[PDB]
Amino acid sequence: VNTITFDVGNATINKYATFMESLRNEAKDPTLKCYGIPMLPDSNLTPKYVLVKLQDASSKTITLMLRRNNLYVMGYSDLYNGKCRYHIFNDISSTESTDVENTLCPNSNSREKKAINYNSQYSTLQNKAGVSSRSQVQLGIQILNSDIGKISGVSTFTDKTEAEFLLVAIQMVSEAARFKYIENQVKTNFNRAFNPNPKVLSLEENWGKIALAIHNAKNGALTSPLELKNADDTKWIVLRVDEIKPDMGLLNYVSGTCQTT
Which residues participate directly in catalysis? Predict the structure, then answer.
């Protein structure tokens, strides 16, 4: 398994772009694509995971563990009290939890469990964060930096603090890797906090359906309309791959052949 580092504490637009490029190039299958868009591999291709190490401005770090097949965050680690502490989501199987423990913290003689005591669904994370919509949790580089400092090396912290950090990190790492549109929202707002707009949220919620729509399209024509949102919360009825492709960084894994270019 590879570990890709993003220096949040000394970040720039160009270093975030490079981070996104590196993460997509690690995660993608070496050959699968549809309409020129790289696709994630099956659940069997090794390495099955990708690690992302987030560094704050005091060189404290938090390492996220991503499943390569779908880019979901499985858990994260940090260094406290001389130990590697692994924090696994409660919605991971026993077998995957063993991989998470041993991938995040391979030294079994100096590690500690500190579970994430809730699942990874956006509805759940929003509930723990106290918000009716994650539009209400701002994203940004200084927020991510600050959030790392509230957790890394910190004995105890609230579920709200943790859920806020996860909402931010999941969206600025996995969702941005999935969607060039979301990468670009971060870059357009690089110097400031921002609220994820209706198009961000719609893309995030529909990523799997988008992948299938593109994989199934014949000669660039979607088999059925794909309804998403524009940034002003109006409907976006997608009819051709041409309209959605620019927003895509990675397709979810879909079995079977497709139009490859």
Answer: 175
Token pair of 5, please? 């580092």
Torsion of CA 180, 182, 186, 189, to 10 degrees: 110
- Experimental approach: X-ray
Pull the structure tokens for residue 20: 């996104």
Nearest to 114 by CA among 104, 126, 125: 104
| Residue length of the chain | 261
Q: Is 150 helix (H, G, I), strand (E, B) or coil?
A: helix
239, with CB counted inside 10 A (0-12, 13-18, 19+), is middle
> Token pair for residue 22?
């590196």
Instruction: Give all domains of the chain, ordered by start, each with its CATH number.
Output: 1-177 (3.40.420.10), 178-258 (4.10.470.10)
Resolution of the experimentally solved model in angstroms: 1.3
Report how far residue 140's alpha carbon sits from residue 168's, in angstroms, rounded to the nearest whole number: 8
Separation CA 186–CA 172 (nearest Å): 7
Count of other CB atoms within 10 angstroms of residue 31: 9
User: Active-site residue numbers?
Assistant: 175
Angle of helix 159-169 relative to helix 122-129, nearest 10 degrees? 130
Q: What are phi and psi of 239, to 5 degrees?
A: -115, -20
